[PDB]
């Protein structure tokens, strides 16, 4: 259906939170990779709101501890994903209408993500 749209919109919203945390704890954030269907679209028209697909929070050593990704424009089984490297931790969120951004059945709010990234910073970050 059309929920996809808001999902990408919601996806953009997610990025904001990430950036905010960067200023809070003074930790390095990096834009990892942009959309291929936006680089390699030559004349084809493009309606998506933002051009960024993958980003991450890297520690002082540059090694990431938190990764966030969004599904491409034409792929099947679209989702938004989160991963903690080296910790065997994967989260798979959808956008359910009325509820909001939810990890499966459980809502994914700003506070939950802030806590998760703070835990990763305290635990996994080497320096």
Partner 1 sequence: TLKALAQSLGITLKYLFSKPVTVPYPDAPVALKPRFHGRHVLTRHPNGLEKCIGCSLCAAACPAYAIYVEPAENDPENPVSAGERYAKVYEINMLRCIFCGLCEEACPTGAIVLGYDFEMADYEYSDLVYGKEDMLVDVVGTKPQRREAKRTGKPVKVGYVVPYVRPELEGFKAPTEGGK
Partner 2 sequence: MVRVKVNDRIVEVPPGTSVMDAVFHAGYDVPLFCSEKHLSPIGACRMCLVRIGLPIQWQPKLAASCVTAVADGMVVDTLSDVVREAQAGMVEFTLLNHPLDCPTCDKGGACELQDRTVEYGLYEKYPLELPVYTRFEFTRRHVDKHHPLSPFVILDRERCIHCKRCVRYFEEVPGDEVLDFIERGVHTFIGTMDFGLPSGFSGNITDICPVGALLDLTARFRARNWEMEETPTTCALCPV
Partner 3 sequence: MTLNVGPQHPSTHGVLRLMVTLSGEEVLEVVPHIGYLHTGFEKTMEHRTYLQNITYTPRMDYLHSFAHDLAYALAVEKLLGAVVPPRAETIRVILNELSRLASHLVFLGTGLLDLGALTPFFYAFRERETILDLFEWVTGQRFHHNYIRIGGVKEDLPEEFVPELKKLLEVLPHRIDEYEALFAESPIFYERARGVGVIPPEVAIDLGLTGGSLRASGVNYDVRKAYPYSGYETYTFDVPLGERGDVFDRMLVRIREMRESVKIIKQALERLEPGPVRDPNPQITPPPRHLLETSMEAVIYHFKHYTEGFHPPKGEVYVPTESARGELGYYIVSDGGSMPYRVKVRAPSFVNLQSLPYACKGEQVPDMVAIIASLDPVMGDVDR
Residue of 15, 11, 10, 21 lying closest to 115 (CA atoms): 21
> Which of 4, 16, 20, 39 is close enough to bind partner 3 by CB under 8 A?
39
∠ Cα 68 74 77 (to 5°) = 60
Q: Terminal CA-to-CA distance of the chain, rounded, Å? A: 44
Supply the minimum distance, in Å, between the C-beta of residue 98 and partner 2.
Answer: 25
> Which of 5, 25, 28, 31 is close enough to bind partner 1 by CB under 8 A?
31
Cβ neighbour number for residue 110 with a 10 Å cutoff: 13
Query: Which listed range, 1-9, 13-21, 35-43, 117-125, lies at the site for partner 3 (CB under 8 A)?
Result: 35-43
Query: Should residue 41 be labelled a site residue for partner 1 when binding is judged by CB under 8 A?
Result: yes
Total residues at interface with partner 2 (CB under 8 A): 30
Query: Should residue 1 be labelled a site residue for partner 3 when binding is judged by CB under 8 A?
Result: no
């Amino acid at each position: 259906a059309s929920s996809e749209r808001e999902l990408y919109e919601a996806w953009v919203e997610l990025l904001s939170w990430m950036r905010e945390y960067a200023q809070a704890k003074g930790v390095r954030f990096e834009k990892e990779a942009d959309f291929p269907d936006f680089i390699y679209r030559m004349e084809r028209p493009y309606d998506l709101p933002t051009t960024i697909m993958t980003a991450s929070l890297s520690d002082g050593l540059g090694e990431p501890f938190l990764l966030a990704d969004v599904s491409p424009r034409h792929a099947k089984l679209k989702r938004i994903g989160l991963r903690l490297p080296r910790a065997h931790i994967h989260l798979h969120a959808h956008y359910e209408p009325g509820k909001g951004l939810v990890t499966g059945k459980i809502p994914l709010t700003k506070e939950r993500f802030f806590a998760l990234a703070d835990r990763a910073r305290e635990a996994l970050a080497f320096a």
